[PDB]
Design a protein around this ligand. Sequence first.
Ligand SMILES: Nc1ncnc2c1ncn2[C@@H]1O[C@H](COP(=O)(O)OP(=O)(O)NP(=O)(O)O)[C@@H](O)[C@H]1O
Lengths: 319, 301
Amino acid sequence: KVKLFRASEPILSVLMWGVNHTINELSNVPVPVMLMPDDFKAYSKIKVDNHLFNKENLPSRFKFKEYCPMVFRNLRERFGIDDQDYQNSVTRSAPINTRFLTTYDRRFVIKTVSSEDVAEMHNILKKYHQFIVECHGNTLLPQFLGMYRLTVDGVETYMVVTRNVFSHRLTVHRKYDLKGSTVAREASDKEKAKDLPTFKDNDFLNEGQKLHVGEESKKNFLEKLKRDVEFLAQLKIMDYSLLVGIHDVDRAEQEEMEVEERAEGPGEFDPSVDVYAMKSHESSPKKEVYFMAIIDILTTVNPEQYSKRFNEFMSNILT
Amino acid sequence: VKLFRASEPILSVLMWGVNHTINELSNVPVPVMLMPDDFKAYSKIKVDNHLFNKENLPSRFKFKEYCPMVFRNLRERFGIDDQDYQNSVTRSAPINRFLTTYDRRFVIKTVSSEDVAEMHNILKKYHQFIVECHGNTLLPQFLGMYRLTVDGVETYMVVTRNVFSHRLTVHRKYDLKVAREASDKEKAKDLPTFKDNDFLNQKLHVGEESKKNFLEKLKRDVEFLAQLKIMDYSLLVGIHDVDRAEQRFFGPGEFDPSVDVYAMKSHESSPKKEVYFMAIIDILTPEQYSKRFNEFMSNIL
Ligand SMILES: Nc1ncnc2c1ncn2[C@@H]1O[C@H](COP(=O)(O)OP(=O)(O)NP(=O)(O)O)[C@@H](O)[C@H]1O
């Protein structure tokens, strides 16, 4: 049952160590009836200075800092995530990939951020938590599960953990980053020649792509979108995108059969897990699954105007 | 949930620290052998919490464990499971600097910085002695050694196995090592610590059988100690009186010899039915004291 924290780079193993440590300590801390103001200004810090001990995978010397752990544990709770599960998917095997990682099981995403981002998080955290609670966790917004600072070789590195917009099991065959903004966003020649290019607004437009999801899902989604984007506007926030992943069910059935031949449900998902996933309309051309969420909310137009244009472009995304 | 509630914050840090280091060790593989770096090694962690988890721990403190691999191995060679050790330190606060765990299994002794230096000077030879005697000794069993920093002051502690039983009440105590005895001011205490001249003037008979094993062990121990130029140590004797204890259920004079490692049953030819505990203590602060000590303690049984 041991945990070597073996990882490709020393700061990944420090990440694993720190998530493991803080989740254990938290397991020793009772679960409060309510959050109090200073939970939003709180942190935990540890400094480790080992010597000739346990240095197969961890560095002898490192620091780990968790921000407002009572508040992020609460957020995890409101997002339907068990702390044991979170810990396990960070620490049971190395995350794989400023920098962008995924837990080995693709449940969670770990993004390196800047000092300034950490500041943005602190000043919006109370209002964001209040938002999450009055919308019961039903939001296209990023679900923030934890925020850390690692110190390795005297270098500080800030990280935010977030739920994967995409499914942990269904393959993403196409993806767009949409802002709806006035001036042209097409994907690059370098990006378009990549394996899974992140396409942009005008790519989506000039592909003629529509997204048929049918009425009840369309309404749920658009209502989430209105509430979220007005929340962001009132926080005076701009330049966020909607991330759109497309999964082709037929294509994945063929991919799976090809790997299973080389060994010599289908297009169905757990909405409790793949929380941004929607199946295509019962009368849709190709059986598809989409994943749509807002991203990059940390860091001509004003934020109210950003809200308006974003909501219009995303509502016309889908029939 | 393991709230580290304790009389002093230093005991809260000790509980937190043992918990933390044993859990971390459960993630460190048991090596095929100890290596020389293990005898020069330590772990250190500094905690700085701001408005978080302040309910029983200090927000700021430090914890250092000397030579964790060596002491985990000694724990194994003394037949002590790490989870059990952890449980005896962490599950409830130790109690009365000299403490025992709440279950009285282990003693926690506050210790000088020079003692820590003497421990690092004797530890490697002491480990190989524990090896060569397959862990049956009367020497103190060192289970772990820690430096705690709370409120800016350092505090060094050694954890050792209790000489007395963790269940059976001990009635008479003797600290036997120039004549010394107990003092009228110490005499007005609950369980007196009596010395060797008080004893000589607590009549111990264990039979012809156990005496042989016991004194083979003692001679081996104090020969090694003399070879270490260690002197001025004690043999600690405790006497539990069954009939007095009388005046589902454990039995009177009932003990687990795997737990109460030093216990020793009465002989028949003994005026009262007792159980006695014996072990060498206080070896951290010459040959003449090897010979005189051996002679005395054997003519005590
Ligand atoms: N070189 C350093 N060594 C030690 N601590 C440091 C160092 N640099 C920064 N810190 C601390 O680490 C914090 C984290 O960085 P920062 O991104 O500014 O957080 P913050 O937004 O100012 N926190 P908050 O006031 O709750 O919003 C800094 O504010 C300092 O408290």
